[PDB]
């Protein structure tokens, strides 16, 4: 094959890999293309391997604490170090999983960060819209403990 | 009590609400009264939040809230929610809206960043001979014979 054609198919292989990888994580039809089948075959083949490395990567990746603004530099360093001592099909799959896990940890950092934005939405709205005074006049938040 | 004290406790009531609701969504004792309130409100209406799950998930996907328009939409919806009355149920509804809104905002973020990571993988495999390595071995489809 051509080295250009492989790169174009990789986008389709990685999307399917992230899909079927996520689907077998959630739960734990046939793809409409060959690259979609490849990404699916690679996700299911090593399901048992990715789980034994699950606790390790979940802890180490939360140590790295990757964000949207530093995700590229960490991907370049880690990917480079991954293939420095050789390239085999297993390390290619590992590159796919790293992109999968990296995207997960980036937007767990984002949601937790945005959940603080929404928290300020609620606090300020209840303050400036008498919702807090409504609850204050009825005995504070603790009053809701008698519901149910 | 004063509405100032209520606003300060709301941040802790909402954080606990998002916590214990999520825990029951996927799947001790709080260390304070406000943490218990957010927990009491989350478990009391689990079956109600479940019957409204498909409707709010579809409607919020229609809204397509982002981090840059989440405040405009939160202020309009909260105002319209309390325009025709304030009761304890509508207060709980405001908490759930903040919970779902933060989720749908970063469903948009994950899919958006999954395209950033995709460009990471494609470009790295291109500029680091990984694509040529697989191309010289028969393209992505060759990986379909792994696993037999």
């Amino acid at each position: 094959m051509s080295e250009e054609q492989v790169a174009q198919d990789t986008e389709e292989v990685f999307r399917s890999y992230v899909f079927y990888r996520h689907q077998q994580e959630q739960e734990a039809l046939q793809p409409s293309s060959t690259m979609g089948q490849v990404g699916r075959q690679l996700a299911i083949i090593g399901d048992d391997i990715n789980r034994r490395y699950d606790s390790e990567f979940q802890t180490m990746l939360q140590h790295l604490q990757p964000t949207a603004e530093n995700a590229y530099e960490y991907f370049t360093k880690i990917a480079t170090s991954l293939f420095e001592s050789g390239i085999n099909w297993g390390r290619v799959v590992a590159l796919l999983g790293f992109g999968y896990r990296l995207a997960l940890h980036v937007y767990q950092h984002g949601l937790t960060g945005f959940l603080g934005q929404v928290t300020r939405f609620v606090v300020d709205f209840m303050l400036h819209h008498s919702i807090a005074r409504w609850i204050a006049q009825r005995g504070g938040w603790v009053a809701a403990l008698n519901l149910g | 009590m004063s509405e100032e004290q209520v606003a300060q406790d709301t941040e802790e009531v909402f954080r606990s609400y998002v916590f214990y609701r999520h825990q029951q969504e996927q799947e001790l004792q709080p260390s304070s009264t406000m943490g218990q309130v957010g927990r009491q409100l989350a478990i009391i209406g689990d079956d109600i939040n479940r019957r409204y799950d498909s409707e709010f998930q579809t409607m919020l996907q229609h809204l397509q809230p982002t981090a840059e328009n989440a405040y405009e939409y939160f202020t309009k919806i909260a105002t319209s929610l309390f325009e025709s009355g304030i009761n304890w149920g509508r207060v709980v509804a405001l908490l759930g809206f903040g919970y779902r809104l933060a989720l749908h905002v970063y469903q948009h973020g994950l899919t958006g960043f999954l395209g950033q990571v995709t460009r990471f993988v494609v470009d790295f495999m291109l500029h680091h001979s990984i694509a040529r390595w697989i191309a010289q071995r028969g393209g992505w489809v060759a990986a379909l014979n792994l696993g037999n």
Binding site: I45, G46, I49, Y53, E56, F57, M60, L61, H63, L64, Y74, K77, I78, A79, T80, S81, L82, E84, S85, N88, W89, G90, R91, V92, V93, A94, L95, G97, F98 | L146, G147
Partner: peptide
């Protein structure tokens, strides 16, 4: 030691084990 170096390492045995049981 370094976190970046440790993650790249665990990706290697990652793939090498995968490559050993499927390639």
């Amino acid at each position: 030691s370094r976190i970046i170096s440790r993650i790249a390492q665990e990706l290697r045995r990652x793939g090498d084990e995968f490559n050993a049981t499927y390639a």
